[model samples]
Target: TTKIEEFYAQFGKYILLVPGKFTGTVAAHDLSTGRTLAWLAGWNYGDTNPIMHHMAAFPSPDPYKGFEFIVNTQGGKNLFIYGIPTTVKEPGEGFNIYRVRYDGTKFNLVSNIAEKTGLGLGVHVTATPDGKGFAVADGQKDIFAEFDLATESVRTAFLVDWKPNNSDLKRAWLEGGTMTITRLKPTLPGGKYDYTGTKGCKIDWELVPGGELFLEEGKVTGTRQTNVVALDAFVYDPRGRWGALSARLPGVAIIFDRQDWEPVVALVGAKGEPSSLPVKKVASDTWEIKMDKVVTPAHQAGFSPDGKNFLFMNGVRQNNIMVWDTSNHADPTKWTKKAVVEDPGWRGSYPNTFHMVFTPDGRKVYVTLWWPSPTPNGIAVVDARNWKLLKSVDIGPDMQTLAITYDGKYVVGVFSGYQKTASGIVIMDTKSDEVVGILPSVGGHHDCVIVPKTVEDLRCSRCTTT
Candidate 1:
């Protein structure tokens, strides 16, 4: 048998959970048989048309217990809704994140809460090392929050940006009229609208709940209201000594000393001078940060498996990934940039980097390159030892997020695939670094994670190093 076939025969029984963006469902797949075990309807049951965004599973607290709880982001809104009365106006009201339990037979929705989670458009999630809590990357607000697993309470909420006066708010009023709702058509960057597998789907908004205020008129606003942090991803150090949160607009990483949550450290500055800017505490959770130079959009921040270094990818303007020596766990000032990694084979416009994964040995780091046009999309492999770009391997178009197998045998890449032909999943062998297999016809899958059998399986690349 081939290497992939051998892998399937040995690990196929393990389940892979993937959240579908366009399909509005989270599916469980059996790797050996390549059969979808079950699907959870993520879109049909929310206050709004909810699309499954991202998810992370917690390791079982009890040794006897198997996989127990999986947290999911429900009905994520990229655009901010402020004026609408019934719409989610505050952080504590929206039922955005839900906790579910999945057995071999089926998946059950256990509970959902937003009261103390401060979960506004939780684009990405990661579990704490102790499995007692989770950190959410709030895409809508400038909030990076941590939720306690047992209490379901937000232990610490870090406001990355404090826009007190809401001067950045841009609002446009919509005149009173019958609102016709058609299928939302998203325009891809440097590409035309994709109408694949869609029909004449239209719904009219004649009446709804809490319409006494907006029945006559309503206002349309931008994606953000007060501040635009656009927090994309949050990751904790493998050793659990620290945690890093990435804010896109400011292009900075907020590092939290696990021992002391308050007065956290923010890494801000120019391309070369990453530690040039100083952070001052302004509000209770806010910090005043000034950029020494123009900052690009920051995507993902991750650490090496050995917990010796941390890296953040600045995609848009910088088009490079910055690394820092984080050996001194308690000291933030001592942390300095080790290297700036840019793909030598970069062709055309600088492609954005999304989610990244480090192999089991920490010898290599694979970053998802978001180059949709001009050049095809792929993954940038970087040597963690020397902190240098090894090469770029073409995976597929519209590559979004990545998930490594529990044993770290393979790294799986998911494609959002605006076009029907582009949506699929690709697998790369960690040893060979070759595209071993591609699962075609899996459309619009965004985020993914492998369910754990034992606590060792929990180390599947999020926090702990097995």
Candidate 2:
């Protein structure tokens, strides 16, 4: 019997697992209404196992082809690409993107994409806009490689010392580092790394430009200089021909140009004052702005689809959403505010809002809450037009990261890093704002991306899980 059939036969339903031995069942939910869509599990037991790492879903543009969830296992840090066949109740072993896909039922290796290259500790995988290929970030090598879906060959594209400061590699966080964007080779799976010597393609954190004024010998007189700013969010804006990077370390939003990778706009907070600042680009080089009246830790920021406005949630004492106009990316002037929906006398606490995204049409905005309290946590949708609180949906405990499909069809919520039970992915229908299906705990998932069919597969998948 297949894994799906075995699971159904033994558990009599969909069973969610925990981390420990005999830790007991984590969750058991029936899928009688929607159907058991697909199962991709991740384990952390080995270096080449796909069941040992994090997993992400890349839904295809062609509905018939369905979605593909890339599972990154700890063993060899290999990638297990599982294709979810939308037409069938039971899914077969699809072609492997790296090594052979293990058919546990048949006990055979199906396909192999890792004939030439060694195993890669695959950390992140992203497909280009046209969906021709994908770029994989390897934590082990501190390099990014490209994989060709058609040829099944992977090539080293560009390398960056993302951790230039960390001489002691043993102490560094494998998953913690600055984000990067690079151009892919034009040819399928094999082209010289075009952006290798390209200027402005590589950008990382550095000390803040200006020095801060500090007290010398217990007397307030001098200044301290720092250029390193805390990066909160980053996005590529083709219209402005730049990538917008925002920071909230000291309540400021800084926009950098992608061409030269220079700081184009710097919205500074009042000197010596602490506040929550959120910003987004609405037009070319123009950004919408919102600053907290009182200092509150507002962490997340994003732009509307049309690039007309921006929205941000304040997670501190003043739990509210701020709306702003970015008609001028260089100099944003106007601002608006909307308080998060709360029952009268209900006070918001920490981790009220952390990550957020806008709908394709920019009509609604979804915000995620974390920390302080885990339950009563999920997403709060706000009307983009007026910045009004629309509704709040309750997702179960341990929800950390949230991402939506490019087409705005499905929203996926991932729960990870729990000891007693394994983490899982919950898929929700955007139109109805309801949980339609659950892609149970495949492995420990952190960040996730949705790859459309238009995207070409780039880079060889590596890793294994015991």
Candidate 3:
């Protein structure tokens, strides 16, 4: 078997914990024994403003060039959180990217790429359509720079659609060999950004070699295209070839060609005025939600890794989760609802199944609860095969996101708690549904990932000791 394949074989042994808020330590959890192998250091781990949301890890099919870049908003790089652009913390100087030790031990600095003037927030990276390398995005400046595995950089950086008032780009993907990005133009009530389905905005671009962004002549024809309305609650299938977005207010999502980035179904409120479910509207000059459950809310949405099934919390009734069977992988309208999961997690704890993810094998799913619960704010692990609730384990409050380990052995969560109460990453074994370990106080960090160890570096550890 290939080394990367073997690493996948022994998947449950360890996992990398991406840190957020307050710290820059990426930890390693030894899943077998519920122990921390090492609190790998030397990377920037902090909150990538929701308005500027992005994933922490960079995905590359070629593992040889795997690297973890850090966006530290701490002592090194000072950041002005959303809404209060002046609330600075020690003020940042530059950005650092690291080649974390594959063995869960530590990391060595690859190079500290300077935050180009005026563009500072390093949000996340999106893999190319072919997955050869990836692009890193700057949500603040609306710039998406490309990075590759072989070279210190595998890609180029370019500015896509820019919105001055709310320029924070939510996410980006490589479509038809072009770098496509989405900008959320949230029209929250009275200016506060609570939820409101999707006011909708998106843009696409064709990246040229080097860092040059050309708009004409096919000399790297920077094809910039766009789309609107849509959905929130973003998710990707196993390899990111397919995706699903929730209908926070629109309506439940019907499967579509993820590459086409279009949906088959349209949603309107019961009154027929064209509405979306579960709207979160954070009002005027605000960055946070005005109130939880501003509208019924888009419970959550995602697809199975196999890329054959897409599932979402059907917010129309606010009582169930629905799965779209994409038997005709490319035709979404032909897709039909295949399964339903009746959940009381929302009614009971105020948590809608807002955050969800699936195992690498695509057989099971792990979803998050959004609000504080008299009962512990936890995650609902479900059987994708049987389409039933397996169990709910209370980890803590603000379980913001769910990411399955690259190996598919465990489902992990981020306890992004505030108020100095709770924050960290939680791990659960897929076989037993048992809590394996918890990295405490390491909460609010958004970079959680299982950096796929390549066939090299001897499986994330020492061939010869450091």
Candidate 4:
């Protein structure tokens, strides 16, 4: 007989895990015991959020796709796509996302994105308005794609790929004697090699622009940017429609045109570029980008549950709180840049903003500092509307993985990066504003979730075209 897991046997209350292991298996833990009672394989992993619906969790991992050809040989070996050297990793190859459910003793593999598309990966999960499907943030890719739950299909929008080989490689020549580099594909020390063995290639001449990816297909969909924005995570508008990409590095945010249900990729460079800057808008209803110098290098973004406003925190020891207004949801231009909070009275003496979670009701947001400081590694409660300093509670030396259950039941904080020493899960009573319990050391990211009372309970706000 199979030994049942202590995790799923309980009435309701569990924490999900994609492991950051990117190994294709997602796990669930007993919140009370700090032990992983069940781990299901058949899916790869990456830095993904658990989009819990009625039955299970949605975890995004590396699509595990490599250069095109040579049979199904390299498939297993390529669980997580290796990053490019120096600059970090691949320009694309985000994971096709997946979803799974818990069944008392085992977490079932419910959806495999590859079966629907052949590729997947990204930062966060944006459930659609209809709730039958979801979109994954491929900050490393040029195309915008989504996974459909109703029919288990994947609908792709905004496509971008390398132009066919022997074609015009944009930019110009670096003038030199007889060895001038003309922006040619594979032209450095120069060989017939290309980056595509990403399966099937053996030529620098084949580097021509396909012109197809930029040309696009089907309908133009909605507002979007074509190039990858390097997004590690993001927040969705509570209205169940708009998406504001935390393109924080460039000191700006990319708010997509949300008139349509899907995203049409935005054009980059020759169109969206402004010489010195990284992005530029080139079309009508295609983008609503807001930039500010005060909030440089912003990350960890979230929108008020009311959908009326959004904010991004600049991490790395800077106490900058940048917020925005979405009163004019339709016309992107009408959106407003509201407040930039650097108020010492608000953020106080802190290290960095590592993670943030908004109360389900949307009135406030809780943040955690990056490093474990001896002063106080606690949670900060701030006014969601005004960015005012509220109060912080003493938890440990440092904290991260800020999260709240879908019901807004309790606040969950974990000691980030601490393999030991003040490492554990701190569960807080949202209603009482009290630190409830601290579990032993069993770490996870934003992948935390509490089990539901029943199957019917999971079908709340995010189940359909609400």
Candidate 5:
């Protein structure tokens, strides 16, 4: 049996905490207990602005068997990599890669390869399917860079330079930019390539060969390959294509004759192909009625299992789930809507929906809520069958990114609370719909990936000393 005491002795000492004293500490908590796990830490603990948005954790590839936590620090728009035992309070410069042990404690600094030249806003981090490497995107810069984990370095793989077409409103308040995987490099530890001089890569205006719009003449156009924002990218291996949930902001009317603020799901051919940009539009297939007003910032979007349908949730305006039929890649048009879960006891306190994921079987969906109220906020699971509310477990007051174990046993959430003193990882049992464990005092808890126990049923090696 794996004893908590034994686990702590061996691995607990390495777990570092970013004490909430820093200017950007988003959350902080005591690591001694399970329920006190803090997740999302926006800007250190007490401070605000420049927030660490999302995080992802996964086991390192062979030759390096430890776990890795990839986090985005909003303060300097820098990415911090810490090996286990490296707490949030540990002073370390930004690095492209860091080392972590299996017990979830102790992190050793690896590399500070990517240099931030301008004000970079790091949003999301995801590892490749094989786990050899990962990718990071800067919403503010509209740039997507891939990292080589082995060398702890990052190289610009795809560049979506955002140059507005309507010179008149060049200074307009455009929505924050976003990126999703259209395709991944075939080689592990992908090479660094210079895409700066690519042609037709005009200042974010013209569309790629894909059907989706990159930059629109009026509203925040996704007409440019670089203009897509608030959309999650998904890859469909069977179809050899990648898709995104693209939307036009409110008031900014769509150039093509259609609803003013409706968002659409779009598909593009996998990367490395000839310009298959905006391969096809899939939103119309799932939606028939457009909201009276546009959803201010369509936050995160994704596809259901089998890649037959799509789903998305916005920041404000009606918090509802938009579902689309994506059976057809070109001219996809089938739509439906499911209102956000509204529990009577928590009336008006809608879960500020951000990111969501579908169960492996595609029967259930999980979403993270960022509610500003005092009510404990966390993850909400929904029945995909009817989009009915299934369960809501409280991790903390401010919950952001969420990742489930591949086996569907555990659900991990990043919690960042009021004083920035409560930030860490909340582990939940999905089958029982209950909080099982809390790893506390982590800086800006973002996302996490289960470190598979390898070594042939080798149980967790316990440790005693802190």
Candidate 6:
């Protein structure tokens, strides 16, 4: 009891915002003991929210004020649009972007910004530097939308990764498809769908408004198909001068000059040696970026603490991490690949990387290793200075996103239960590079963001930098 009390006395000021993808719970936890501080469910707001996936704390204009954040509920995981159904039994609404605030004691849902329009699947949220708004990686639309909070409106939605002459060729295949619902035999309290145990259950069906969405390819005609990039995630430099958007399909990172919200270059993996095309400006928002071989199928994009190097995780066949030197932000031609890092401590044959976070000092980078279920997932640490894999420490099964504490002493990880595996959280000591504790959590937590309580808490590790 004394140890636990001492732990609280030292680290109780910090908190973590964790969202459960399956259970529809957005919870807050104590940084010291991994104990649930507060939580609000999707049903609490009339089922307007579901699939609580990723979140980002808004970097307030005044660094000392406000603890607001934007959490995205992606509606569904893939083109099939598989997720929990609404309790109100109303017409189907697509994905949701919610504005919420945590006051250290209570968690409140401020508003549901994307409720009425129900536009696209918001997979990730990145706050603007000024804290006036945020950026959404619309996974379903292949568009990066700039959402303005003051007006509660979308400033601009850029259609990335696809530019076809025909309008029909650009439409996603699952768009406008009728929605469907699958309800499991409820065995838990309040008739809630139970997933902690067996997957055996009868599915009750009902049709709604939204389409059966798919993030992958869909045929348009014979030898003709729609190009679906499925914009997965987005990140901004520490200074918010540049942005990097990750596309899951073609597997490339699109660099954007945030000053005017335009694409500056497209980094793609090729078969030949490393090379690049001359940086030439075409139309108002268009640019020519030709690049040769770089590792690919990038899941997430992140910048180092000081924002010198931009890195992303290459999954599947590539199975590596690549770092690009972004010190030369003015000239795209000067931006070059820094290193290709491969982890040797992987236990599974196809170990994939999900999210990566850097320590406050920018000395090391900690990444979550995502592999098949029952394969024992872990966190891979890399030496940021040399850009090499230092070691991979086994945490548990199916780890997803990660975050560093406000004091930079520990790293927290959450499990998403992708394949009906274990779902919880883990804490690792930064100096020792070992998991210190594992704690129970809401079913299938997808993403976590550190919440700073005071003025001294200036630099947050993930999603945004203060």
lDDT of each: 0.57, 0.37, 0.42, 0.41, 0.39, 0.59
lDDT of 4 by residue, 12-100 (tens): 34453323222333455555445676764432333232221112233222111110000001121122222213342332232334555
Model 6 per-residue lDDT tens digits across residues 1-466? 2556654554535677788776778887766564677788886676643667678776543322347888876542221233334344443343667888766567778877665323343567776655566787654555556677777765655654343233353233212111111111334454332221112111111111111111122321111133345566667676557777776544566666766766666655322325233335556554544323223344657777676887766554356777778787576556778787865653222566767778888898888776665688888899999988888888777788888886788887787666255677787889999887777775677678777443223334444421
Runs of candidate 2 with Cα error greater than 4 angstroms are 1-228, 238-240, 268-294, 328-349, 417-422, 454-466
- lDDT per residue for candidate 5 within 291-407, as digits (tens), equals 222223344455564555555443333445555455654433332232344444332215656666565566777788666646677788888767677877677766755555544
lDDT of 3 by residue, 70-110 (tens): 33222222233212345554443333333333322444544
Q: Which one is best on lDDT?
A: 6
Q: What TM-score does each of the candidates earn?
A: 0.76, 0.48, 0.54, 0.59, 0.55, 0.77
Error of 5 at 18 (Å): 11
The clash count of every prediction, one per candidate, is: 1, 61, 37, 37, 70, 4
Whole-model lDDT, model 6: 0.59
Best by TM-score: 6
Residue-level lDDT tens digits of model 1 in 397-434: 67767777756778887776653456777888777888
Worst 10 residues of 1 by lDDT: 172-181
The all-Cα superposition gives candidate 2 an RMSD in Å to the true structure of 13.3
What lDDT, from 0 to 1, does candidate 3 have? 0.42
TM-score of 1: 0.76
> What range of 10 consecutive residues in model 5 has the weakest lDDT sum?
457-466
Clashes of 2: 61
> Candidate 4: how large is its RMSD?
12.9
Which portions of model 5 miss their true places by more than 4 Å? 1-54, 58-72, 77-106, 116-121, 147-295, 327-350, 419-424, 437-439, 452-466
Instruction: Mark the 10 consecutive residues where model 6 has the least summed lDDT.
Output: 201-210
